[PDB]
Assembly symmetry: D2
Homo-oligomer: 295 residues x 4
């Protein structure tokens, strides 16, 4: 037998950082969960019980805190690239670092129509994520995403004209509820190293904001022919607005809300045009994915 692939590291490292403006008194907080996995010339730890090649996962944890102390933690694309580069440069035998960051929302509170200097609210479990792969001699690959963005529209969604055969019971519809949890990932062109990532720093927050805005507007305004068709429109627009993105991937559940026929009870009308009360279905759910790239 032989080791074909190996990676190891520390997962679920929770980190909080505060920035304090001494001039204005304003404080800004960041909170993340970080995972770092390393690869390189480490086979002997598996095959020969040779621990000399192991950077302890505990040390990886310490390194995350030290790096956060000495560097900006935002945008997360930059912090991830700094952290990954550290490992491949510091250790001769480590040749790849894989850094995953989940950013948690701490939104500044408005109290009496004024932004508060040091108080924050978690407005939704929506996350902003990065995956950064730093590979020695091959640069830095960054995938940025948003996830956990949960939306619903109560009309202006249709689904008709699908394949009908002996397995089909679904009725065609011209008016249904559409609800999903959005997972959207944009993959950046490969960067040569940290200097190049630094050169593009302003594009990271701007592209996240664009991806979010395009997703929300398209969902709200499209008279949707299917999840497939609406999601493609979203992806097309993001690619048009940021030339440094190579691909956009969406993964969308279709969270079903069923009509409830109440006609058995005193002829109560609650279907089609008369539908007011629906039963949200926890499971099963449709799952629709697509990756869109350039011609």
């Amino acid at each position: 037998s032989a080791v074909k692939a190996a990676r190891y590291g520390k997962d679920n490292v929770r980190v909080y950082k505060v920035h304090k403006d001494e001039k204005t008194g304003v404080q800004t907080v960041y909170e993340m969960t970080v995972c770092v996995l390393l690869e390189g010339e480490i086979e002997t730890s598996y095959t020969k019980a040779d621990n000399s090649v192991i950077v302890a996962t505990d040390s990886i944890k310490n390194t995350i805190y030290i790096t956060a102390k000495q560097n900006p933690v935002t945008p997360p694309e930059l912090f991830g690239s700094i952290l990954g580069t550290h490992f491949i440069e510091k250790y001769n035998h480590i040749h790849a670092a894989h850094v995953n960051i989940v950013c948690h929302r701490w939104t500044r509170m408005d109290i009496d129509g004024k932004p508060h200097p040091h108080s924050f609210i978690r407005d939704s479990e929506e996350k902003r994520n990065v995956q950064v792969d730093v590979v020695e001699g091959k640069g830095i690959d960054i995938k940025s995403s948003l996830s956990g963005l949960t939306v619903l529209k109560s009309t202006n969604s249709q689904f008709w004209g699908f394949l009908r055969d002996e397995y089909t019971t679904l009725k065609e519809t011209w008016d249904r509820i559409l609800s999903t949890d959005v997972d959207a990932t944009w993959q950046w062109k490969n960067f040569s190293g940290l200097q190049e990532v630094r050169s593009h720093v302003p594009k990271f927050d701007a592209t996240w904001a664009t991806a979010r805005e395009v997703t929300l507007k398209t969902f709200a305004e499209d008279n949707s022919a299917s999840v497939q068709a609406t999601m493609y429109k979203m992806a097309e627009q993001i690619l048009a607005r940021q030339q440094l993105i190579e691909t956009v991937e969406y993964s969308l559940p279709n969270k079903h809300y069923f009509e409830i026929d109440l006609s058995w009870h005193k002829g109560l009308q609650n279907t089609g045009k008369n539908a007011e009360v629906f039963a949200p279905q926890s499971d099963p759910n449709g799952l629709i994915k697509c990756t869109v790239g350039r011609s």
Copy 2:
């Protein structure tokens, strides 16, 4: 042996309702999870296998949908009171209904600075809840709550002057992070029946909004001496603003963020005045409760 207490019913009944304004085109959605448990002269179903006394839990489910079709579902205090009253009036042998409602957020989207007519976002997992106990001959008891409101302040929290003995290692502090998930419940004076609940309908949404506003403002502005002291201030203010409330209860975790001493690494300073990077602790957590009533 004897049956000392019994209740039974249906839990986790998900309900969605849409309201459509034909004049303006504007749609408004409501989504809830409902639980209804009944009590009354039902001992024989347990002791003698006498099912004749059982209103099937499946029928309770049907009743929830029918009631939602024929009545407003907002404010939830009213809907809960309608639903509970139905069971005690319809069935001679049922003498109490216990209705729990969890309301999920569907907040209207703003697209280009304008409210969208039929598109919604789940902004946070904060819930608005009601517990309604309808007891034949004893009226209607309503507890209203908000839960899952997660906040953090990065300064203006202190904790010093506590008891120190041979079990104590905690250092006194004049500047710490304070973060909690707010669970706040206000208990209404007993109502004689549905007519009285209906007479107070406007107070329910207004009191929820007040409870939320008082909680956020007090948390943000108090130079907190402890969770105990800040929470009492919140409760006192709610009782002052709504005379129909008898008690206010808060249950608050203290979600700890620990300093990380980095001095072992090149004398890096990250404690006290120099603290920037902290480690959020998943567990354990402080838990602080209080119920405040009138003199």
Copy 3:
């Protein structure tokens, strides 16, 4: 305004203890999650920012570890009683301690038909719990429970003869699936103090084992007329086998498995006597409770 009730303490304190037999080499592990909440003359911490009355929750955490070091942690009824008594005796102004313990399963592994001396498996998320209320001058109240015991029977469950009215769609049945998650609590007679709890130590594990055995056997063997009827049989038997128990409470979800009519597809028969494939329902669920005491 006035403080009507208050309690505070530490929740989610994870504890592991190992016992090592030097003679045999055999090791035994215990793992628990502990919550301790205190009450007493502490109103001034809320109303006057008087921290002098506060035993810090951090100190409560330390006390749990110290107590576990110096005392047996099994049975949990005993450990809980020791821990609660400590607080009311040590602090003059603390008059009640409320101790909740959840015990996690670590079952010794069998390797080649022999019990292994130091290796363990988590066989199910079933828990054994205690709630211990130690109140100065009023003794020790103990509720013991098992929870998270998930069972299913594929036949020998019936449900017919229930109330039928204009809200009823449920068909009577003489053969259905019955599945539940068992939550069963037995409440001990009040104990005068620690000496009395110690005198009954052997009864705690034996009564837990009896409660579990009675639950499983009755579920498996009863040709069930309803959840109500089967659960009563369980409770009656536990009360008969342990005279020091005052009441037994069961709380049981009815986790529904629905028939799937496939007759629309080539006349495939999958209902009634021909039912083979079913759809487990995540929600809603029946919820049936009962508390059984002595005549």
Copy 4:
């Protein structure tokens, strides 16, 4: 823009099947959660709102139930292969099916030392899984796994001799607790089609049992030099016992249990040789992966 990849289908489809032996009266239950995603000539549903190419996800759900009615559901490798083959054969324009199955435990109850004919218990949340990829013209690729197997050993684990630099605080140890949740996947050689999968049916359950037994025995008996070294031993043995497996992958968290220094309290000794009470850490955790193949 262009569609680079697309797949869509139904997730979270819960299925239960019962088998009834008329001769012996014995019943056996199976419960699974199934996901099926399809690929093929479906780009136009995304780009042109052409639904004619869409097999509705609702129809995919129906197909899962029908297939379960007409075929054995065990071993899951076979059921998955049947289900995936159905889609690629039935629909000319569908060229790949991806089937994920999670099997839930329903273990027959022993009542008074005898196996019960129709009563079952969920003994642990350990799962047996399959991933089956059926690709037109390229055969059937099957990955089988077990997950959620949670174990702990209280001694006979060591970790010393790792890299020490200015980022390292971890002390070397010759005696520690080792606890993990096992995720182990074995990848079968490619099968040419359903006939070949059928020819190997007995190997699927036997290889699952072997993988489980090897994992448990190796964990219990190895005087572990690291997670890396012990996991490699497991993988090597599985590959030796089943020639039709090409690779074995393990993914293992290192769930840390920390010593608690109690010496500040009356010189209480609870570290090193004297350690009895430990603090389980919820996060962070080590994460160690390896894929082992043949020379």
